[PDB]
Ligand binder design. Sequence first.
Ligand code: NAG
Ligand code: NAG
Ligand code: NAG
Ligand code: NAG
Ligand code: NAG
Ligand code: NAG
Lengths: 285, 364
Amino acid sequence: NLPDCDIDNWLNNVSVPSPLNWERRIFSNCNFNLSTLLRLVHVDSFSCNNLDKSKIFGSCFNSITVDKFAIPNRRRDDLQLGSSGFLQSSNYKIDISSSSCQLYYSLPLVNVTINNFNPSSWNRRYGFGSFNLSSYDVVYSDHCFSVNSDFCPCADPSVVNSCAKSKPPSAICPAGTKYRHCDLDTTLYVKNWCRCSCLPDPISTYSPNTCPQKKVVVGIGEHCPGLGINEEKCGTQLNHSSCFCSPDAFLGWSFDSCISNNRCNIFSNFIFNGINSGTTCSNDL
Amino acid sequence: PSNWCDGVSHCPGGEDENRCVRLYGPNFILQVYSSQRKSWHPVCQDDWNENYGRAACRDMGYKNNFYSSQGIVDDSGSTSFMKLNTSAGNVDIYKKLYHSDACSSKAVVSLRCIACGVNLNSSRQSRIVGGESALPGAWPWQVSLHVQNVHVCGGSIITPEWIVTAAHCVEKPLNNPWHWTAFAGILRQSFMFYGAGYQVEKVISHPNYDSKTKNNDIALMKLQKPLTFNDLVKPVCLPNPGMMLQPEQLCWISGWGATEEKGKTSEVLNAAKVLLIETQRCNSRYVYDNLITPAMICAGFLQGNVDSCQGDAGGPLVTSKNNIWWLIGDTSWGSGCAKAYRPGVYGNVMVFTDWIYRQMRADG
Ligand SMILES: CC(=O)N[C@@H]1[C@@H](O)[C@H](O)[C@@H](CO)O[C@H]1O
Ligand SMILES: CC(=O)N[C@@H]1[C@@H](O)[C@H](O)[C@@H](CO)O[C@H]1O
Ligand SMILES: CC(=O)N[C@@H]1[C@@H](O)[C@H](O)[C@@H](CO)O[C@H]1O
Ligand SMILES: CC(=O)N[C@@H]1[C@@H](O)[C@H](O)[C@@H](CO)O[C@H]1O
Ligand SMILES: CC(=O)N[C@@H]1[C@@H](O)[C@H](O)[C@@H](CO)O[C@H]1O
Ligand SMILES: CC(=O)N[C@@H]1[C@@H](O)[C@H](O)[C@@H](CO)O[C@H]1O
């Protein structure tokens, strides 16, 4: 009388994610069948680590952490276990030491739509939105940058109302935050020359210490804390104006597609839990 | 001076263009300017004896100094070589040179006019900001210049009689050689007090030096008494046109500068490793907003923490190549000390290598 998990319905959903915004569904207290999961899903390849593939039949689990995200064509090879590629260091780390069965499969291009996102607060209170692209692209981060719970990309109205060269854009930051760095300097005859912080671009800042934008790596369970923002591209020049950063500043992202033989590629790292233990068992016999 | 090596004959005899001589390459391949084709061509080893080497170094602002001379296989890819002849009864070498397709010995001349670019072996020396102590003898060209027996700017030597430094230290009213006093081969600033001074007989400043943009910043102190060379004091070879100085190349800076900005000068000579910064990278809108003239060099780290400071001015920018040190830059000015995005800015000696020789020969 115990119902089915219907895991196959979740992978074959019309909404297909990206490695930047991989989700997680904790399947628990329901049935399944690996034969039906192998048949109803057009599998490219199926592999298991730290758990025998033949031992899934009959043995069961407490809760299955099921993740999914689409495969870029140029990033198919980076999903190797333990690699240091962009996907495994800035999109989704795969815990090698835990029981994980990886599944490779594709969905037809007629019923696949992609809801790209950017899990983060540091880079979504400060101007962002539709990832400008076409009807079949899959974002993938190539370097994740983390910042404090106080970095106002926008500079300070006053320093600039008195600067006179390198006038970097500026806006009133939000109640509870701290103005960006700026060291009013002098060179030969150019007076008050302001070289505000994180100047060139978050990935060319030869000051990996002065730029509050520090570099980081994703982590089992945790998505990307934040992407990249040219700090000379965030803000209008008018002063009395909120910290509206602009859509053309998001650098650190790349739009490779998802189309292999007339079909879109998707992956999964079914994280497991509780061998020979649980109430989410199966009828595989 | 300035009338030398310009393509126009000034004196009626025309010695200005017929005697234009310079070295070339890290292996010191001699060149002689050909007035008929307006180009520099190397010389043959064939039928050459050491007496002509005396005349070559003398016209090269090196007077009688002559270390060694031997023949090496050509590497510059030149199509023509100067060829000597012994049938002429005259005593001048330049009337004896004529063009030839190739030399019989298949070699060109490596001319050394002074034993420079060699120091005692030193292991650990990174004494400018963020480092450890130094050892004596590793930088024997480095000298300190004093006004009223206190340090103002550093200096480096290239001959027993000449010291190069920055022009902003010798700016008015400090353009009088009586005020300057140089000390050679002493590491501790507490020891350069009693009788160790070498007075400067005449200060030389660049004629087109301009203080607003601080470009063409070069200066030449000349001593009355030539420096007696030993293990603790040795010159550094003036670099030649035609070396492919790679980007990021490991160079060494030295001087008695402060360990931090606005701080007091160091008691002991400091010297640490820095890196080259390419000039088109430096003169962009970002690094200095087109402030870098072609006679200027940016060196150090954009991340900072290893840079020149006040008192490091006049110091040498040296690199190691074929076991010979080359003085490619002179510390002109620095926006802060040990700071990011504002590295050390250095004057290009390479643009002014010919200008040094023009003062060397006229004041010999
Ligand atoms: C509902 C379901 O998916 N489970 C099926 C079961 O109905 C079928 O009797 C058995 C044999 O083919 O295979 C299982 O996978
Ligand atoms: C079943 C399904 O989801 N696929 C539909 C198909 O029924 C429809 O006839 C055709 C129109 O594009 O293709 C998909 O939209
Ligand atoms: C407003 C918007 O974001 N959409 C633009 C679209 O108008 C343009 O045709 C396309 C070309 O690449 O670039 C998108 O970013
Ligand atoms: C969390 C907090 O309030 N502390 C901030 C920190 O976020 C910031 O990185 C640092 C440097 O500006 O200044 C501290 O005051
Ligand atoms: C010395 C002599 O009698 N012969 C010279 C020759 O050396 C010279 O190269 C040539 C033209 O330059 O003119 C000849 O008269
Ligand atoms: C290179 C050549 O053939 N020209 C010689 C010249 O060098 C020499 O100075 C002159 C007079 O002695 O006689 C010329 O024939």
